Amino acid sequence: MEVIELNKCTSGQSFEVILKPPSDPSLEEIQKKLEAAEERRKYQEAELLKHLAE
Amino acid sequence: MYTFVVRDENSSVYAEVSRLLLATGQWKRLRKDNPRFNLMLGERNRLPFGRLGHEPGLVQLVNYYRGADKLCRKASLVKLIKTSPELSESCTWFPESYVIYPTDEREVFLAAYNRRREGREGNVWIAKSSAGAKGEGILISSEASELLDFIDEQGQVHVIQKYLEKPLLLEPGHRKFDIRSWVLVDHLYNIYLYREGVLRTSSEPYNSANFQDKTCHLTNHCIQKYGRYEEGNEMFFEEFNQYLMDALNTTLENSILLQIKHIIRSCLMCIEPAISTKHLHYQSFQLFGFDFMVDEELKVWLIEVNGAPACAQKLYAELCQGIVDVAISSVFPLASIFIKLHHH
Amino acid sequence: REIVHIQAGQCGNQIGAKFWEVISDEHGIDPTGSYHGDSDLQLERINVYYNEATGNKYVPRAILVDLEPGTMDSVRSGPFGQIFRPDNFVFGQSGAGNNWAKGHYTEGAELVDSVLDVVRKESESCDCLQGFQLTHSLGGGTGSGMGTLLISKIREEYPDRIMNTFSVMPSPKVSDTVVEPYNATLSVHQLVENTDETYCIDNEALYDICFRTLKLTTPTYGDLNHLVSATMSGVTTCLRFPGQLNADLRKLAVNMVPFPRLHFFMPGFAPLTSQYRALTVPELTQQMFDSKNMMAACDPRHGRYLTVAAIFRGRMSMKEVDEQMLNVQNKNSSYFVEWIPNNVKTAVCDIPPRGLKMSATFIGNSTAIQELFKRISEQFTAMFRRKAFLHWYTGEGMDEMEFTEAESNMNDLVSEYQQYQDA
Amino acid sequence: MRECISIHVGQAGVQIGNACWELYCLEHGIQPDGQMPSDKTIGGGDDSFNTFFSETGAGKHVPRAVFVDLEPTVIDEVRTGTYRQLFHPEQLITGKEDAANNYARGHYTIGKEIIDLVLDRIRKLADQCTGLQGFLVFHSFGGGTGSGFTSLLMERLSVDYGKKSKLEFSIYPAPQVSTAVVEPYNSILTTHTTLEHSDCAFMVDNEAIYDICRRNLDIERPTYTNLNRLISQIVSSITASLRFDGALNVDLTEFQTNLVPYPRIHFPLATYAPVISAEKAYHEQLSVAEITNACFEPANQMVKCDPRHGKYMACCLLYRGDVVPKDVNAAIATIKTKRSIQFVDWCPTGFKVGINYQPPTVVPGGDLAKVQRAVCMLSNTTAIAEAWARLDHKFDLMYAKRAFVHWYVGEGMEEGEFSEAREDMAALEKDYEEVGVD
Numbered sequence A: 001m002e003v004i005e006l007n008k009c010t011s012g013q014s015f016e017v018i019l020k021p022p023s024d025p026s027l028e029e030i031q032k033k034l035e036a037a038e039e040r041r042k043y044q045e046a047e048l049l050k051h052l053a054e
Numbered sequence B: 001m002y003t004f005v006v007r008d009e010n011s012s013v014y015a016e017v018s019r020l021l022l023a024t025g026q027w028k029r030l031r032k033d034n035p036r037f038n039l040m041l042g043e044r045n046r047l048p049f050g051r052l053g054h055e056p057g058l059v060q061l062v063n064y065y066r067g068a069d070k071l072c073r074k075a076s077l078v079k080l081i082k083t084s085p086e087l088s089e090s091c092t093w094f095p096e097s098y099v100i101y102p103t104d105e106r107e108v109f110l111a112a113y114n115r116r117r118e119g120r121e122g123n124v125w126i127a128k129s130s131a132g133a134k135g136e137g138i139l140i141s142s143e144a145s146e147l148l149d150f151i152d153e154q155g156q157v158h159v160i161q162k163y164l165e166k167p168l169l170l171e172p173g174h175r176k177f178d179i180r181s182w183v184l185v186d187h188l189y190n191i192y193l194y195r196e197g198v199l200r201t202s203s204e205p206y207n208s209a210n211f212q213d214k215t216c217h218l219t220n221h222c223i224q225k226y227g228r229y230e231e232g233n234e235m236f237f238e239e240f241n242q243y244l245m246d247a248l249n250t251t252l253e254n255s256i257l258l259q260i261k262h263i264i265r266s267c268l269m270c271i272e273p274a275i276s277t278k279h280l281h282y283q284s285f286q287l288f289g290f291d292f293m294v295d296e297e298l299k300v301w302l303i304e305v306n307g308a309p310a311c312a313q314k315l316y317a318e319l320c321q322g323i324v325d326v327a328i329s330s331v332f333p334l335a336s337i338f339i340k341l342h343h344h
Numbered sequence C: 001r002e003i004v005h006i007q008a009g010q011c012g013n014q015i016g017a018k019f020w021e022v023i024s025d026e027h028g029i030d031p032t033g034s035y036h037g038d039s040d041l042q043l044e045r046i047n048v049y050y051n052e053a054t055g056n057k058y059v060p061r062a063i064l065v066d067l068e069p070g071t072m073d074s075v076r077s078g079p080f081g082q083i084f085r086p087d088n089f090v091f092g093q094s095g096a097g098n099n100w101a102k103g104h105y106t107e108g109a110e111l112v113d114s115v116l117d118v119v120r121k122e123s124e125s126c127d128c129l130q131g132f133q134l135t136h137s138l139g140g141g142t143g144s145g146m147g148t149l150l151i152s153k154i155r156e157e158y159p160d161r162i163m164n165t166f167s168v169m170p171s172p173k174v175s176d177t178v179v180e181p182y183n184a185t186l187s188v189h190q191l192v193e194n195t196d197e198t199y200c201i202d203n204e205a206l207y208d209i210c211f212r213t214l215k216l217t218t219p220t221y222g223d224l225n226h227l228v229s230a231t232m233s234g235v236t237t238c239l240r241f242p243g244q245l246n247a248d249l250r251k252l253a254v255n256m257v258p259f260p261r262l263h264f265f266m267p268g269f270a271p272l273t274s275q276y277r278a279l280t281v282p283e284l285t286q287q288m289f290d291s292k293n294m295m296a297a298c299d300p301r302h303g304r305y306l307t308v309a310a311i312f313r314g315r316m317s318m319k320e321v322d323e324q325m326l327n328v329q330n331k332n333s334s335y336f337v338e339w340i341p342n343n344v345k346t347a348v349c350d351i352p353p354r355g356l357k358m359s360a361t362f363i364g365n366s367t368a369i370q371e372l373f374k375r376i377s378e379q380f381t382a383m384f385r386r387k388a389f390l391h392w393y394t395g396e397g398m399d400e401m402e403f404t405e406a407e408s409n410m411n412d413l414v415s416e417y418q419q420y421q422d423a
Numbered sequence D: 001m002r003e004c005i006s007i008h009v010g011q012a013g014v015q016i017g018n019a020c021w022e023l024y025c026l027e028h029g030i031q032p033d034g035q036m037p038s039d040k041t042i043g044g045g046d047d048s049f050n051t052f053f054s055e056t057g058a059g060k061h062v063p064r065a066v067f068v069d070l071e072p073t074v075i076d077e078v079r080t081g082t083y084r085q086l087f088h089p090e091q092l093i094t095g096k097e098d099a100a101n102n103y104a105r106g107h108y109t110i111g112k113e114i115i116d117l118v119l120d121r122i123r124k125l126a127d128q129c130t131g132l133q134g135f136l137v138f139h140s141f142g143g144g145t146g147s148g149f150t151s152l153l154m155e156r157l158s159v160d161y162g163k164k165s166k167l168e169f170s171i172y173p174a175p176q177v178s179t180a181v182v183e184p185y186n187s188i189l190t191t192h193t194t195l196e197h198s199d200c201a202f203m204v205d206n207e208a209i210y211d212i213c214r215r216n217l218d219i220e221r222p223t224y225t226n227l228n229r230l231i232s233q234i235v236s237s238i239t240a241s242l243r244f245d246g247a248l249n250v251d252l253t254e255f256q257t258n259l260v261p262y263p264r265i266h267f268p269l270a271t272y273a274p275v276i277s278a279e280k281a282y283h284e285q286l287s288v289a290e291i292t293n294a295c296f297e298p299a300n301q302m303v304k305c306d307p308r309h310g311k312y313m314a315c316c317l318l319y320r321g322d323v324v325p326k327d328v329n330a331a332i333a334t335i336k337t338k339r340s341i342q343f344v345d346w347c348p349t350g351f352k353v354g355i356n357y358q359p360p361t362v363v364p365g366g367d368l369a370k371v372q373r374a375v376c377m378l379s380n381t382t383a384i385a386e387a388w389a390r391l392d393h394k395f396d397l398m399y400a401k402r403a404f405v406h407w408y409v410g411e412g413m414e415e416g417e418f419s420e421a422r423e424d425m426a427a428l429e430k431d432y433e434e435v436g437v438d
Ligand SMILES: Nc1nc2c(ncn2[C@@H]2O[C@H](COP(=O)(O)OP(=O)(O)OP(=O)(O)O)[C@@H](O)[C@H]2O)c(=O)[nH]1
Pocket: C246, D009, D010, D011, D012, D013, D015, D016, D069, D070, D098, D099, D100, D101, D102, D106, D139, D140, D141, D142, D143, D144, D145, D146, D147, D171, D172, D173, D174, D177, D178, D179, D180, D183, D206, D224, D227, D228, D231
C-alpha cells in the first residue's frame, strides 16, 4: 500500500494510494437526418390532407 | 394479500412451497413475468437479480442468494477454500483438491502426487465436475496420468480431489455412505440446520481393489438404481444414531454433528460479506444441500455444497413447511424443526 | 397554452353549460365574468379556458353550436348565460331531427363555415393553442353528425393540434328515438379517425348510478348532467391548476394512447353519495376503481387496463395515496397489461371541488370498453339487417354502403380491443 | 485558467441547474445580485472560480451557463426567482410548446427549429473564453426535451467544438418520481445517439435520491426541491475541483483519464456520505473511516446496484472538510480487508484521493445538516450495468407490441431507429459483461 503523487495547497491536498499492481457525423449528415424526418412528417400530413379532401 | 411468481418449474422443493403458500388463502400466484410480486421463486440459472427491488411499494424477496454459486460450484469451492484466509490452505475438513483445465493447478497436483507415489502412501484420487450432472463424468484412479487424459477428453473444468480411502463402513454390508444436511439461510443471515438429514448409502460392499466398478464407490441415489438394508438406500438420523450407539458406543451428535455444524458455519460465515442482503434493496434466502463423508476415525469431511437441492421424499412436507415459517412468513406474516447455528 | 371549447347540439350544450358553471365556480368567476376568488392558484392557469376582456373580466373560450335555437336560448337564460361571448353563439333554425345525415351532410353543412369562422377567431388570439375539446352526444343529429363534421373540418385546418371529445353514448334505457344506434355508429367511425382522446360517457351508466347508487327513483337529464360536469371538472383538473407534472393535452394523449385507434376512455368519479361524512383515502381509492363508479357501462374485470390516470383532489396524505394506489393494483394485478410498465399514474391537486373536502377522478383506457361498442353494434345490426328506419337517411342522400362501412369499422375496433386484451 | 460552460436542458436540467448555481454562489461568497465582496480583482481575473463565472466591469459574477427548455414555465421561474439578477437574458432560452415526453419531437420536430439559436447563444459564451475546456450538460433521460433535444445538441457540439470535452449529469427515470410511461423509450434513444459524444456521464437514478431523502432526511414525500438540493451537493462535490485550487480532476480531460479506460463504458457510479437531517437536533459527527465505509453501502449510491458483484476499473474519493491523508489510508486499509472490492486484472487496485478543506456548504433553511466532513466516491464499476438491464427490459416489454411507437413515427422518426438504439444498448450490456464477469 504505497502513497504517490502527494500535492498540497492551502485549499486541500490530493494523492494516489495503490493497493496492488495490475496482473464523428458531419454537419451535413446531421442536417440530412433532420430534413429526412421533416419530409416524412410532410408526407404523412399530405396523405392526411388528401384523405380529408376525399 | 401477498403475491409470488414461479420461475423454476423443475423444483420439487418449491413446487411444494408454492402449494403451501396457495393453501393459506393469503398468497396469490401471478404469471412468470409479472413484476409486481412480493416473492420470487427464481430460475436456477441467469436469475435477474438486477431487476429486483425497484418496484415502488413492494417488499421483494427471492429464494436465491446472488453470489452463492461461489460455494456451490466445485471449481470455485476449491478456490474459495484455498484463498479465503478464514478457511485458509490450513483447512482440515476438506480433502486435498486441485482445479484442472483441459489459475490452473496441473503442476502442483503432480507435485503432491509425486510425494505420495514416492511415499507409497495411498495415492487414489477422484476427478469430477459440477458439469457432470447426476452420475456422469466421474473417474477414480490410482494413477495420476490416467486421471488427466479423462479430463482432456471432456471440454470442461474438473476438480481432482483425494479419494477418501478409509471411509466409515456401515455393518452389515461393509458399505459406503454419505450424509446430506439441509441448511436454510434467511434474509437476516440466520443459519438454520434442518433437524433431519439423510444418509445416502451404497447397496454393495466397499471394494478397495478395483475402482473400475463405480457402484460401491459412488453413493449417489441415481447410481444405486438395491434397497435390501433400507428403503431406497436412505437411512435417517434416528437409525444411524442408534447404530453408532450400538456399534461404536457414541452418538450422532458427538461423533459427527458437531463437525457438520462447524463446517456449515465456517463456509457460510466466510461468504457472508459478499452475499448478505442486509441493507440491500431486495432480500434473499436460500436452501442449501451440504454433502459430507465420514472416515473410519469418525472425522467428517465436506464433499460439496448443492445450491438447488432436492429433498428426501418423507421429509418434503416438514422441511417445505419450515421454509414457509422461517424464510417467507418472517418477512410476509399471515393473519422448531431447525437448529439455529449461532454466529458473529 | 389555450384550449378552445366547442359544444354542439342539445346534449352537448346542456352538459357544456354545466361544465362552465362548475369550473367558473372553482376558479372564482361569478356569472358576470368577474373574478372574486381568494387564492392565486385560481388565476395561475385560468387562460387555458378563459380569455381576459377589458375591465378584468374573464370570458370562456367557448363556442356554442346548434341547428335549432331552443337549447341555446335556455343557456343564455341560464345561471351563467351572460359569461359567454355573444358572438360565439352559432345556431340555425331547421333542426337536425335526430338524424346524423342532416347534421353531417345537409343542414349541418350550411352552418359549419360560420362555426369555423368563430373557431378561427378564437384560435388566432391564442398565444399557443393546445387543441380543442368538444362536448356532444352521439345519439342525436346535431352533436353527432354536425359535431363530427366539425371535428373533420378542424383537423383539416389545424392538423397538428390535439382533438378531445366528451361523447355521450346512447342507451335504450335513456333513449329519445330508435335511430340512436345508427347515429352513434356513424359517429364512432369519425371519432376513431379524428380524435386523440374520447371520454366515453354512457347514458346507461349515468342512469344506473342515479338509480342504484344515488337512490333517485326518477333521474332526469339534469341529474345525469351533474355526474358529467363533475367528471369533466375532474379530468381537466391537471390542465386547469398549477399542479406539477406539467400536463398539456398532447402529454396526456402520449401517456394514455399506446395505439392510435384505442383512445376511448372509461371515466369514473368518487365520491358519489346519496353528505358531510369524511371520506378517507382508502375509500376514495376503492370507490374510484369500483365498476359502480364508472361512467361507461363496462365491467373492467371483463378486460385489461392499458393505461390509467387517477387524480386526487383535496388535502390528504400523499403517502396514504401512493400506498392505496399500490394496494389496489395488487388486488387487481390481473387487470393491468404486464407489457406496459408503470401504466398507472397518480396525480394530486390541492383544490377540492365545490362542497367536497376530497374527491378522486378515474380515467381508464381499458379493453373492456369493447362492451360499449358491442352493445351499440348489436342494436345497429338488429335494425340494419331489415334496413329499418333507413329512409330517414337515404332521403338525405346517403347510401347503404356508408352504413356498412361504419359497421365494419366499429367491429374492427372491437376485435382490436380483444386482441390486446389477450396479449 | 480554463473555462467550463454549463448547459441545462428541459425541466429536470433547468431545475437542477438552479439548485447547483444557488449552491455555487453560497460556496464562493457570490450574492444573488452577482456581487462577490471577496473578489478584490474587479471586472476580471483568472482565479479558480472564474472557470464557472465571468465578470462584468460592475463586479457582477455571471455564470457561464445556458438554460434551454422548449416551453417557458420552468425557465420563467429562473427569470423571476431569487437569482434573476445573476443571468443575462440571452442565457435563458425558451420555446413555445414542449416535446410532450416524445424524444422524436424534441430531437427532430422542435429540435430542428431551435438548435441554431441555442448554438448561437453558446458561441457567445465561448467567445468570452480564453481557453474553453468544454461543456457540462444537465438533463433527464425521460423528458422529450431532456432526451431528444440534448442528443441533437450533443451531436452539434462535437461538430462545432471537436476538441472539447463533454460531461453529462443525467437523471435516470424512476416511477416513484413523476414519470411518463414512454421514458424507457426516450432513455434508450438518447443514450444511443449521445454515446459517441459524451466523454463521461454521471447517472443519477431518481429512485435512489428519493430513497435517500425518505430514509436519511425523514421526508415522507420528497419534492423536486428536496431531490434537487441533494443532487446539487453531489454535483458540487464532483465539480469542486474545477472551481477551487487543487491537483485532482482539475480539468475535464482528467475525468476521462481517471475514470474511463474504455470510451463506451463512461458511466461512473457516484456514492455520497453523509446525508444527515437538518431537523435532527441531536447529531453525532461521522469520522473519515465511517464516511468512507458508507461509500460501499448500496443505500448511499446515486444508482441502486450491487458493486460486490461487478468489477472496478477506477475509483476516486473526493472529500470535503476536516480530512487528512493519514485517516484516508487508515480507513481504506480497514475497508479492503472487510469488503468485496475486486478490480479488473488489467487495472491497478487503488484510489485517487482528493481533499478540499472547506466543508460542504448547505442551503440555509434546507433539509441537509451542515457536516464537518463529507465524501463523494466516483467508481467505474460494471455493476452499474444493472441499471441498463432494467431499462432495456422495460423497453423490450413495450416495443414487442410497438406500444406508443406511432407517436414517434408521427414526428418523422423511422421505426428502425428503435431497434438500432436497442441493439446499441445490447452491445453496451455485452461490453459490461465482458469486462466484469468471470
Ligand atoms: N431529479 C429531478 N428529476 C426531474 C425534475 N424534473 C423532472 N424530472 C424527471 O425528469 C423526467 C421528466 O422529464 P423532464 O425533464 O421533466 O421533461 P423535459 O426535458 O422538460 O421534456 P418535455 O417532454 O418537453 O417536457 C421524469 O423522469 C422526472 O421524474 C427535477 O427537477 N429533478
